[PDB]
Design a protein around this ligand. Sequence first.
Ligand SMILES: *[C@@](O)(c1nc2ccccc2s1)[C@H](C[C@@H]1CCNC1=O)NC(=O)[C@H](CC(C)C)NC(=O)c1cc2c(OC)cccc2[nH]1
Ligand SMILES: *[C@@](O)(c1nc2ccccc2s1)[C@H](C[C@@H]1CCNC1=O)NC(=O)[C@H](CC(C)C)NC(=O)c1cc2c(OC)cccc2[nH]1
Lengths: 301, 302
Amino acid sequence: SGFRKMAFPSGKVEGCMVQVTCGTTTLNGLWLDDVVYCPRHVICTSEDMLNPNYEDLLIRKSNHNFLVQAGNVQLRVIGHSMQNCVLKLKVDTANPKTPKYKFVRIQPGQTFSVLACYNGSPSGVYQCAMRPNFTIKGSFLNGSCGSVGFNIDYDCVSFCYMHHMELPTGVHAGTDLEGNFYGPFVDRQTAQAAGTDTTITVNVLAWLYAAVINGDRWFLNRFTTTLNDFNLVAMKYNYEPLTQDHVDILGPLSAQTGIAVLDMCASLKELLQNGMNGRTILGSALLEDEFTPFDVVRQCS
Amino acid sequence: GSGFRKMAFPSGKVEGCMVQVTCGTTTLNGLWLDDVVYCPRHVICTSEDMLNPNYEDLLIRKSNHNFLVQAGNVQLRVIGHSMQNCVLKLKVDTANPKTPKYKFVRIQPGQTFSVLACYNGSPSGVYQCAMRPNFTIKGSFLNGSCGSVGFNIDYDCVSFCYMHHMELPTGVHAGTDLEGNFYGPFVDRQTAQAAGTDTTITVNVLAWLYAAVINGDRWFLNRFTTTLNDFNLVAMKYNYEPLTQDHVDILGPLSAQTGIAVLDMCASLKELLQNGMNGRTILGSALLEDEFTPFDVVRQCS
Ligand SMILES: *[C@@](O)(c1nc2ccccc2s1)[C@H](C[C@@H]1CCNC1=O)NC(=O)[C@H](CC(C)C)NC(=O)c1cc2c(OC)cccc2[nH]1
Ligand SMILES: *[C@@](O)(c1nc2ccccc2s1)[C@H](C[C@@H]1CCNC1=O)NC(=O)[C@H](CC(C)C)NC(=O)c1cc2c(OC)cccc2[nH]1
């Protein structure tokens, strides 16, 4: 029993974190095999950061300009290249702690674990979702750039995020490990707004199932709805549409609880229309949308 | 601000200590540090032993050769065994090369810690827990989770504070420190046990009010103060835990950061309890949070 946001164990990723310094800029890097991946703006000085012409800035650097430290050991940089918003530093030493890994671009609504790091040292681990507007609601301070997000499947680490930016609203923006931003953001020192965010409907439904599994049932009702009728209401409330694929993915939770997915939809419609009236679900005064169906099953057997 | 979230400590130093301990068909998690493996003592129980085990008698029948300790699929030879309170200590013939700097600490109610939930010695996930005033934790633990540990990490030293043993009827969890002493009145037997009525963790609500002030959300501050005793007597009326002197002392850094004396913040909380929120929110919420400690707040604000 019980229901907490749960991150993946972070050890496989901790053994890959290093510090990268160029000039007096320092951030975190990810050391896999003989390459260190980090945000390209390690090359920037404060004067570069507003209008960086990154190709120009990079051609002005050589290998010996990059200081890579794994703990208190310097790794020698023997080559460098830029891929989108990431720098790739080839070093002379392979990381024996490299896990089996893949680089993946995650879909909006999927969750991943973040290993927040400072000065190449892991500080904390927590679960985030890629929002529909391609921000993440993380917890990142100065010095966090180059921290990564990942999922683990068996023994294989799927890296999906590298941290670059905090928006004025306090949410965060970053790239995949190919260095392509999620969302309409740019690696420069400007105040950037996101598109209007929406709530991840399939994940709210997953979390309502979690609530029923854990004995919190006050919001259920005897009624049902159609998929299209539900979607009309969802859209009106800035919830994402629910697809038939989402209904399919919710099938195991539906089976486990005996609540049909469209009946759970009817429960959620009533919560959107009426509110919670000062009641809580799983201790929350808000509808939670950062658990996927996978995440609920993993936790709820 | 970003909002506060439960953040766990990175779990790698603890992952490198997890093993499985089997007796018969019963497998629990254990913790390998140096040349000792620590696990719950009820790994020695059969189904028939579990309602009222005579652990001293049960253990006399076990030999070193009855314990199967494995790190992954690799067996770790047991060369001695003893029982300390509700944990078994298995001396093994290999010192764990991944042993971190570590301590065993007994935490107080209100303190938070990370749990590495494991099944058959293999870690599933990591999450942040608070010890409730009634010495339960609102954990997330399935069959096969016993012997998973709770810990904090401070400058590369792991302070282990919890090992998992039990789910109460109410769905909350109970366990021991790493010396095998239960937190709270619980015992390791297959019986339905009730915890005391839970209370709200006052020290942590005060930390949350300090966090609100740090982030510019300060409508609830008043120009009054209270005595500690008067505050504790009001707190009890609202099912809030009384403050200890230790609580007052761990609020010291937040009090310094904000310039709001602890007893002045207590007067502000008292007014919130007596009058309510009256439609207003703090840090975006109509509910007061009680599972972020003074340390957690400073960590997330800096
Ligand atoms: C990240 O740690 C980096 N810091 C530096 C410092 C020097 C060179 C390069 C980098 S990357 C950092 C993470 C941020 C800090 C606070 N919390 C975070 O998550 N990222 C940045 O500082 C980033 C650098 C860009 C060059 C990519 N800038 C911003 O996030 C940023 C800039 C603004 C801003 O500029 C006028 C206005 C409002 C918001 C804002 N965010
Ligand atoms: C833990 O994983 C263990 N399982 C076994 C199995 C065989 C021998 C020893 C152990 S320890 C397990 C964790 C629980 C399972 C569900 N969620 C959890 O957190 N602990 C127990 O199963 C524990 C064993 C005791 C001997 C300590 N028992 C209980 O938690 C328990 C027993 C009862 C109960 O008995 C009639 C009634 C109500 C509640 C209850 N909880």
